[PDB]
Amino acid sequence: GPHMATGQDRVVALVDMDCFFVQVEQRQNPHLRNKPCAVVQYKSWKGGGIIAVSYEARAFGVTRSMWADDAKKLCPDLLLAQVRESRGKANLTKYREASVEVMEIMSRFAVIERASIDEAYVDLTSAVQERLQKLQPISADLLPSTYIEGLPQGETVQKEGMRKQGLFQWLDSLQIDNLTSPDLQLTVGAVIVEEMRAAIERETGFQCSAGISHNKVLAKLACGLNKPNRQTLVSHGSVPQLFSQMPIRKIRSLGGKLGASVIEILGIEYMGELTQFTESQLQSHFGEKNGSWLYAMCRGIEHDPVKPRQLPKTIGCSKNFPGKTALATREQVQWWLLQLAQELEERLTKDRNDNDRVATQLVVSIRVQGDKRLSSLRRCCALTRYDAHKMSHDAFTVIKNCNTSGIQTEWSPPLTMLFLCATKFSAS
DNA sequence: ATATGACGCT
DNA sequence: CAGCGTCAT
Ligand SMILES: Nc1ncnc2c1ncn2[C@H]1C[C@H](O)[C@@H](COP(=O)(O)NP(=O)(O)OP(=O)(O)O)O1
Ligand SMILES: [Mg+2]
Ligand SMILES: [Mg+2]
């Protein structure tokens, strides 16, 4: 007990934008605000594929991975915004630039780790220490949008009434005399996150949600508990009851094959049930690293650091050529490699100017018709010049021998995907 | 017919 | 300037 680590050393937050692509389009087009709206890419096939949905539209059952024509059946008044198309492909520049707006604001408060186009982890341990040294009870007024997971226990017919009662129980209990209380550190962390989220909304117009806990996995989980436009504090103490009915697939990194194996091999359904197994038992089934990770995680402990990185490590461009449209001619493959290369060149040139770095490697990936893998083959070559013509020519050079066609003009088996990625950045 | 990113394994 | 698999938004 006296020597058992509790994973309460850090204060970490995960901030995730609410229906991000939609909010970007709603800021731009006021007509879309406060309406059932979705963002779609490529209109010709079934109205386009939905990639983002406003909360108003979710109420009708509209989801991502849904064709717009089908979404309209569920929600006839659904409004749509289209992703920009350039050179025959979706262009996500608007969303990347909006992402930068948000990341730069977050970086003012603390070290952050860009985790996706719309979320970042924040290591608030130091900021909390400074704020505690600076502060004195914490008023509920400092936590206007915060939920305390697990509370209240023991006006509650409405959600805001429930939120306040839980917050009151939490604050009434808080021991502010001790600067080392983990619960107190989380609370101060939540105050700072309120301030961060206020700054994001004020300076960008975008709303977001956040999770505050002692590690990245719990912070991420916490974030989704009360979306949209709210933040949730998950304390170490809230873990046993939270994990008691938490499907294993809900924890980050367990949503795939590993997660399925955990369920199948151990015959369990919830994250908390993992506590019954010894570390060695878990390592035997899932490997040394996964086993140790699972053993600590089911107890609410994780040590993965918030990495000091707010810029992407790679810059890539990709396009699918489904079914009948699979590229079947050499000239066809070269023309598309050129479109991808030109987009990549623009993005790389801007990156070099903004971030004082240059990519030194080019990775080319493709999918062959009949293969359900994300990638069928991957090859690389030196990226010595930011020249689209050289990059597309080099990319063809490295994959051209995959062509099994006896005939020079033709390409077989036809390609269902092209991917160009710039990597191995070096200071410039 | 359904654009990206990180990172682990070998 | 290795190539493939997994998990993610
Ligand atoms: N599978 C995918 N394909 C393409 N784009 C994707 C996508 N998943 C997400 N996006 C893009 C579009 C998304 O807007 C953006 C953020 O991803 P989230 O955070 O997962 N989802 P959102 O922010 O929309 O809603 P909220 O968080 O409130 O639930 O990334
Ligand atoms: Mg989001
Ligand atoms: Mg997200």
Side-chain angles (χ1 to χ4, degrees), chain A residues 1-129 131-135 137-154 156-371 373-407 410-428:
Chain A
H3 306 114
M4 199 94 65
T6 59
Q8 290 180 111
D9 50 311
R10 303 179 285 161
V11 179
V12 175
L14 187 272
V15 177
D16 183 283
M17 310 304 303
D18 300 335
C19 56
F20 187 48
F21 285 19
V22 166
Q23 288 198 84
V24 174
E25 297 299 328
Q26 290 172 316
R27 180 178 72 174
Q28 184 190 305
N29 187 349
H31 294 292
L32 305 176
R33 305 180 178 179
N34 306 119
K35 303 253 162 54
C37 186
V39 170
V40 303
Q41 54 189 5
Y42 304 119
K43 285 220 76 78
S44 61
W45 187 271
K46 296 181 176 168
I50 293 183
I51 57 166
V53 190
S54 77
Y55 283 74
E56 295 86 351
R58 294 180 199 195
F60 287 83
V62 177
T63 69
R64 156 176 311 159
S65 164
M66 183 173 280
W67 297 118
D69 284 350
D70 294 337
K72 277 285 200 177
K73 298 172 180 163
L74 298 174
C75 181
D77 291 314
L78 178 70
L79 301 185
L80 300 170
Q82 290 185 258
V83 170
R84 183 186 297 123
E85 204 174 307
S86 302
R87 298 192 193 73
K89 70 176 299 297
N91 173 354
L92 306 177
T93 299
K94 187 193 302 181
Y95 314 108
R96 293 195 181 97
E97 296 186 336
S99 181
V100 171
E101 284 182 67
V102 177
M103 308 282 167
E104 296 191 342
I105 296 164
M106 291 184 56
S107 291
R108 299 205 307 255
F109 294 77
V111 156
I112 68 171
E113 178 184 338
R114 183 191 190 272
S116 80
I117 197 168
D118 95 314
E119 71 210 80
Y121 291 92
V122 191
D123 194 322
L124 290 170
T125 311
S126 36
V128 163
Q129 315 282 29
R131 183 67 61 94
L132 275 178
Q133 152 197 356
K134 173 152 88 206
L135 267 78
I138 305 187
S139 162
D141 299 320
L142 298 188
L143 297 161
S145 61
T146 294
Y147 277 83
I148 308 300
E149 177 62 20
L151 301 182
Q153 87 184 354
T156 52
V157 298
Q158 302 191 237
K159 215 193 179 197
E160 176 65 10
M162 273 285 295
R163 182 194 77 79
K164 294 177 87 90
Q165 292 301 319
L167 183 60
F168 297 162
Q169 297 186 341
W170 174 258
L171 292 180
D172 289 340
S173 303
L174 207 62
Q175 73 299 302
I176 312 209
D177 87 27
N178 176 20
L179 279 87
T180 51
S181 168
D183 286 347
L184 173 59
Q185 300 180 153
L186 288 184
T187 302
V188 174
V191 169
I192 298 175
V193 171
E194 290 272 12
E195 301 171 349
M196 300 182 39
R197 290 181 50 249
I200 291 169
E201 191 178 1
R202 177 188 90 78
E203 303 177 35
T204 69
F206 302 144
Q207 292 188 342
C208 60
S209 297
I212 306 86
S213 196
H214 292 293
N215 55 65
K216 291 163 63 170
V217 165
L218 288 182
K220 183 188 199 309
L221 183 62
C223 186
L225 294 182
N226 289 292
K227 274 182 166 280
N229 195 35
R230 297 286 184 274
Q231 59 185 61
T232 304
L233 187 158
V234 171
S235 58
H236 181 79
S238 75
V239 176
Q241 267 297 125
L242 175 61
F243 278 10
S244 77
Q245 307 185 81
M246 185 62 71
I248 287 164
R249 70 179 175 277
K250 298 310 183 177
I251 297 346
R252 194 206 337 173
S253 84
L254 294 185
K257 297 179 178 211
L258 176 57
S261 304
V262 172
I263 291 167
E264 148 94 37
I265 295 179
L266 301 179
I268 60 174
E269 308 175 43
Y270 305 121
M271 198 68 191
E273 294 181 82
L274 278 165
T275 61
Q276 292 318 297
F277 300 96
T278 66
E279 187 172 2
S280 301
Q281 285 182 304
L282 296 174
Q283 296 182 310
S284 69
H285 294 294
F286 312 114
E288 213 145 81
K289 148 269 287 177
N290 290 333
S292 282
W293 188 84
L294 288 162
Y295 183 84
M297 195 70 248
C298 68
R299 293 172 166 74
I301 300 171
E302 210 218 11
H303 299 123
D304 194 28
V306 171
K307 299 154 187 54
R309 184 182 57 73
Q310 77 178 92
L311 295 172
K313 314 166 70 100
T314 61
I315 296 185
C317 293
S318 66
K319 183 174 177 64
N320 285 353
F321 301 96
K324 207 164 186 62
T325 68
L327 316 179
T329 80
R330 196 199 47 103
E331 269 300 83
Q332 223 191 347
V333 169
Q334 297 184 127
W335 190 82
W336 281 108
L337 284 168
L338 177 57
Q339 307 315 299
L340 290 183
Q342 295 186 321
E343 185 189 310
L344 184 51
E345 186 201 303
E346 287 198 356
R347 286 166 65 189
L348 281 176
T349 300
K350 168 176 178 62
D351 183 78
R352 186 177 59 197
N353 287 322
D354 297 343
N355 304 313
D356 298 310
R357 61 177 182 172
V358 295
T360 69
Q361 185 182 61
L362 182 68
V363 175
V364 61
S365 178
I366 68 191
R367 193 181 310 128
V368 297
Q369 195 153 57
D371 201 337
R373 288 177 296 174
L374 191 46
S375 166
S376 294
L377 139 159
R378 256 168 282 197
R379 293 291 188 268
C380 54
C381 63
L383 210 175
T384 53
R385 286 180 162 173
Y386 283 8
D387 180 331
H389 276 91
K390 177 180 165 39
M391 285 189 286
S392 52
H393 181 78
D394 291 357
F396 185 78
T397 290
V398 298
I399 68 168
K400 66 180 175 180
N401 69 297
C402 236
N403 188 358
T404 65
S405 182
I407 311 171
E410 305 319 283
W411 188 290
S412 57
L415 302 183
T416 52
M417 181 263 221
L418 292 182
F419 198 155
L420 286 189
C421 191
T423 70
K424 301 205 166 178
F425 285 86
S426 175
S428 64

